[PDB]
């Protein structure tokens, strides 16, 4: 479903390799008339902003969104020699007795982690890193393929992609019923 969504999201933005319809205008202009998207930055900011927006929404739905895989869970599982003297010994094979400064670092570090500014920052750097990775994959796609003819993109949508999607529309709720996994639709989370 994710791959279909990303491919659908390139075709939706009119981006290459799905841009041959709007591409053929420049080849038949002739010797008497010309285009109109000429001095306007609007349809360029409308275009680039729809690509960025299709990357953020793609990340919201299939990647974490703003979810950073938190390493603070891993350190809890590994560390077992909690010490009140600030030594913070670890029960691991590369571990030792750390000399982290309670007065200088641990008090400061703990406070900055719970700050409203810091935690918000990481939530947006996560969403930003994920949107940027997808922005790369749009640019990489334009530089990797030739163009598809309009009839061929139409066949891709209507005789390949949508049949698979409607097949998955049947199957997915059928499995969610079979494993008692229908979520509650009340305001939780």
């Amino acid at each position: 479903v994710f791959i279909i969504f990303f491919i659908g999201s390139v075709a939706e933005t009119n981006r290459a390799p799905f841009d041959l319809a709007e591409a053929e205008s420049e080849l038949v202009s002739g010797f008497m008339t010309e285009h109109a998207a000429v001095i306007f930055v609007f349809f360029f900011l409308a275009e680039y902003g729809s690509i960025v927006l299709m990357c953020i929404l793609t990340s919201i739905l299939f990647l974490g969104g703003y979810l950073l895989i938190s390493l603070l869970d891993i350190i809890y599982n590994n560390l077992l020699s909690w010490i009140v003297i600030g030594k913070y010994i670890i029960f691991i094979f590369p571990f030792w007795g750390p000399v982290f400064i309670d007065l200088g670092l641990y008090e400061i570090i703990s406070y900055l982690y719970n700050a409203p500014t810091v935690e918000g920052s990481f939530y947006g750097l996560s969403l930003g890193v994920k949107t940027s990775i997808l922005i790369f994959v749009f640019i990489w796609t334009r530089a990797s393929f030739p163009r598809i003819r309009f009839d061929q993109l139409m066949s891709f949508c209507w005789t390949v992609l949508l049949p698979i999607l409607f097949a998955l529309i049947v199957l997915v709720p059928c499995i969610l019923y079979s494993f008692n996994i229908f979520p509650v639709n009340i305001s939780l989370l």
């Binding site: 420049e26 080849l27 038949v28 002739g30 010797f31």
Partner: protein, 95 residues
């Protein structure tokens, strides 16, 4: 006695349509009414060129289209005819 015999048109030049021969009938491989079959369809012409790449710099090909498909393609060339074959007669071989 051309061009003298051609002044009065006493001779006609044997065109290829004179020497046309019917196909052999045996081994030969492959109307108006109220129906819409007799109806005709209009075509529209399209001026293609010049494309961005350098090689197809001066192409003005005029296509006749039935919908999407090409009915007849008429390239108009000469947009880069510079008279090379004539200028070569006024130069030495090395020139």
């Amino acid at each position: 006695a051309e061009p003298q015999d051609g002044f009065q048109g006493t001779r006609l030049i044997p065109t290829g349509a004179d020497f046309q021969s019917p196909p052999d009938p045996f081994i030969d491989e492959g109307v108006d009414e109220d129906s819409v079959e007799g109806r005709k369809v209009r075509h529209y012409t399209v001026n293609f060129g010049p494309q961005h790449p350098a090689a197809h710099g001066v192409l003005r090909l005029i296509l006749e289209l039935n919908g999407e498909e090409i009915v007849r393609a008429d390239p108009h060339v000469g947009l880069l005819h510079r008279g090379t074959e004539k200028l070569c007669e006024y130069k030495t071989y090395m020139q």
